Design a protein around this ligand. Sequence first.
Ligand SMILES: CC(=O)SCCNC(=O)CCNC(=O)[C@H](O)C(C)(C)COP(=O)(O)OP(=O)(O)OC[C@@H]1O[C@H](n2cnc3c(N)ncnc32)[C@H](O)[C@H]1OP(=O)(O)O
Length: 215
Amino acid sequence: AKPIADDIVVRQVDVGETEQLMTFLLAHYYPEEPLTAGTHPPEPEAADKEFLLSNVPFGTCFVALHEGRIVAAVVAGPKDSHEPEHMAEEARKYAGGKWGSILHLLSAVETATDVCRRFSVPSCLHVHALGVDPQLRGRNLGGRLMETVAQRGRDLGHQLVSVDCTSVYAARLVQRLGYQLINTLRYVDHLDASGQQVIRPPPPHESVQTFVLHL
Ligand SMILES: CC(=O)SCCNC(=O)CCNC(=O)[C@H](O)C(C)(C)COP(=O)(O)OP(=O)(O)OC[C@@H]1O[C@H](n2cnc3c(N)ncnc32)[C@H](O)[C@H]1OP(=O)(O)O
């Protein structure tokens, strides 16, 4: 438990208490997240939510509590050099649906960045999701949760954190934290096999920008 304001506390998410975490994500992460907001239907598929929750046992997911409620959350987990092949196979299994479209894009980015080979590190702590209650945006709750993930990464011996900023607001935040931009993929440039634009999110979100932080 880490007091980050006079009223907000950062806590680790435990394996038994994920329902309130998912309730928060479904209210304040998924509806505005550009990949989710740019594919149909608006609601995330079961496999999507299940993937996020599958990171909880790693002890790498954190929430911010205000008055006994979650007002922010970050979901992160490890990856290594097999992640590009694994994402590519996940994308083709879910091909045809919303989660398949999201994975289509995330797999293109993972294959392009390939951070473990790129930077000669054995593993990476990847941030999968970051969300802040709209009433508490502007208070660098996002930044404090990112720093918490980085400290957890250091304890775990990771030499690198990576993050795909699908949102301009996430990219601006990690820029403030000194992350290094390593890849940019504009949504208009990312097509499916039939030549159709996969993700069509609202402006101002024009690209997914992947950043890394050396630990
Ligand atoms: C790896 C990933 O998760 S990528 C996708 C990231 N998450 C999402 O898209 C869900 C959208 N949810 C959000 O919770 C937020 O926009 C976040 C977490 C990305 C950033 O929130 P914060 O940490 O509070 O942003 P930050 O502190 O840097 O700046 C917030 C303030 O409101 C703004 N702002 C932040 N987010 C938004 C937003 N989604 N829409 C409009 N304005 C925003 C400014 O950046 C800044 O304005 P101010 O100085 O005039 O007050």
